[model samples]
Target chain A: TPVEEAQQKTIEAITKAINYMAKRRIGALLTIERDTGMGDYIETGIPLNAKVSSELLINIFIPNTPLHDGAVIMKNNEIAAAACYLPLSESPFISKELGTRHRAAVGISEVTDSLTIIVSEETGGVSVAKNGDLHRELTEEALKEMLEAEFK
Target chain B: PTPVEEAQQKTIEAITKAINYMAKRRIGALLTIERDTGMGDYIETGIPLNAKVSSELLINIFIPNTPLHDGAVIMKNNEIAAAACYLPLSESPFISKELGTRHRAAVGISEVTDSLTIIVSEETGGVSVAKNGDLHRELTEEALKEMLEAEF
Candidate 1:
């Protein structure tokens, strides 16, 4: 994140140097950065449709954080960061549209009142945006209404 | 080491509360217990409008401003009540079928307009305590101070 003139070379060198450092680590070592943003992948080969593109940030999640409701993010399509901590839950609140991962994020949001951004690996896009849940399969009427308000 | 790059994060969980967006949503007004005077204008909140607010959409109005709490706070869409606060009554407008007590009350002010409710504050904001801290409340300070000042 530092952008000083003298540290510019150091900054550029770090990205490459870190890769070498990671190869020496035990298991898999992942790197993430918000400055450069990131891409994502849906391991299920399904892509998450990005219904809205305005004012969006790709949330790839940082491992070790309580964002994953306990499961891991397996695919990377346009994900912008490393997978965040996916702590499993003792009791999960399930939904037909969004299964466990979404439920996990939903659960975390309810208890903590924190914001979550959900994406589907089946589609190479994001289903959730802004601060709340973004249901991909709203009724046709709902979709029409949303388009009018958002596009109009 | 400089900690400028650390983005504070939190976890949220989904409780058993279910919201049906098709039904009419609920809303509440924030009756100003005390008014803040700035510059030279004598600004009063607003004439309470219990108009229908869609739970599925975001309202552009600001609390205590664009919309004032001159009358009873409106409720809709099976809203949830705050953990301890009295249920901000339910629908003055024909038993609001859209929203419930908790969801509507949450939209009133402070939290919803900005951040999520029931979540922790930023790390930069320091630790959170029930008693004592900012906002200048004597009772809160007395109670919280005692908690913090207590010996382990």
Candidate 2:
């Protein structure tokens, strides 16, 4: 029950953070490790032990903060690392319009059992990455549904 | 950034360095980050630090055979509030028998406060987190970062 409660908290926090970033047109990359072993796939970054909060996410992803440069890795409902470099999706099928953040999101999902959320700085569009597929431009309701389904 | 914000960043970097260093050397560690709930009572049992948080200081304090190696470190407002502190051990019958004093203490503190505790195993070099009376064990570096970022 505690685990389930923690999971629920994680989902809520993530949704809140995503919505806040999207509304402000802030660009962000967040990867959630679903099956562990993310380290084998991701470059190490500044390790952390902070809980996932919208304020914290916004602060880290702010325009020029030290940790704002790269993707943030999330595991077990926590923000595990920041400024992390993720593998880029080299798929030629991806739209040319997509930027490095989206590419990286797709790239990581292709290799690991992870879900990545990307907020476009240029358009404030929210996208989700899972199993090598990119689900682009989701509504707030859709985002919440996706998170609940995947995390549950 | 404001002086306060700068200090918080420095503290996070310090923690990242310290956790990585301790994990590599297989040094056992217990770090408690105070949140909404005050840890003044627990802090009172330890030596006053009242010092800026730094990797060098955190590592040195936890090295085996050091005077402060056996207790816990309490962090508050981006500072090391105290070290060598005694924490109440959890008496929950649900805790695994194999878990040692450090794990129990981590769980113990979480049960009473909103604090988040990090633990590193001296034998296995594994990282774990305790929050809300639950223990999430065998975390990779990224997972640890996530937990810390979310809570810290």
* CA lDDT of every candidate: 0.24, 0.81
Q: What value does the lDDT take at residue A45 in candidate 1?
A: 18
Please list, in the order the candidates appear, how each scores on TM-score for chain B only: 0.20, 0.93
Query: Which residue window of length 10 is worst by lDDT in model 2 chain A?
Result: A47-56
**TM-score of each candidate structure, all chains considered together:** 0.19, 0.54
How accurate locally is residue B46 in candidate 1, as Cα lDDT from 0 to 100?
Answer: 22
Per-residue lDDT over A1-152 for candidate 1, one digit per residue giving the tens place of the 0 to 100 score: 43343233322332232222223321111121122221222222112221111111111122222221222222111222223443222343334544555554554434332323344433322232212243453333443343234222
Model 2 has a DockQ score of 0.03
Deviation from native of the Cα of residue B14 in model 2, angstroms: 4.2
Docking class for model 2 is incorrect
- Chain A only: TM-score per candidate: 0.29, 0.94
Q: Candidate 2, after superposition: displacement of residue A58 in Å?
A: 1.5
User: B19-80, model 2: which lDDT tens digit per residue?
Assistant: 88888889899999999999999999986655556575577568675456788999997777
